[PDB]
Design a protein that fits this description.
The chain has 144 residues and is an all-alpha fold. It has five helices and no strands. The two termini are 17 Å apart. The relative contact order is 0.16. It comes from Homo sapiens.
Length: 144
């Protein structure tokens, strides 16, 4: 099932737009609008993913509790790793907003060079934990 993949696709596209640090992105960065819109997207992905795991617990093949429950603890953790990535990205954008206030009108060009470099790394990490969680979810899609 892929309702949570679509909701993550929307998170991921928005963040790809933020990564460009265009005029409008910078505007909405110094206000609380992109961390407010990324929270809403995160929240729909996690909502939809909790409900997909819930419905997959209905179509599980014959695995004994020390293995079927080893697997949900490993899957709740990949859900948790992905949530923690998205929160990390929003905290790095809050940090940028603060660091622009503290410049007191001075050039933020060197600040946007470090942000773009840092955001790319976070987004690299985010994408590999979504891929990992899809794998654990696909092995669980049938049981073990």
């Amino acid at each position: 099932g892929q309702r949570w993949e679509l909701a993550l696709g929307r998170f991921w596209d928005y963040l790809r737009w933020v990564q460009t640090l265009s005029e409008q992105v910078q505007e909405e960065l110094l206000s609380s609008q992109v961390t407010q819109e990324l929270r809403a997207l995160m929240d729909e992905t996690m909502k939809e993913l909790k409900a997909y795991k819930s419905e997959l617990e209905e179509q599980l093949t014959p695995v004994a509790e020390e293995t079927r429950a080893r697997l949900s603890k490993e899957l709740q953790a990949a859900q948790a790793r992905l949530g923690a990535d998205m929160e990390d990205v929003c905290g790095r954008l809050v940090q940028y907003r603060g660091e622009v206030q503290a410049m007191l009108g001075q050039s933020t060009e060197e600040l946007r060079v470090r942000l773009a470099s840092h955001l790319r790394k976070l987004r690299k990490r985010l994408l590999r934990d979504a891929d990992d969680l899809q794998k654990r979810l696909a092995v669980y899609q049938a049981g073990a």
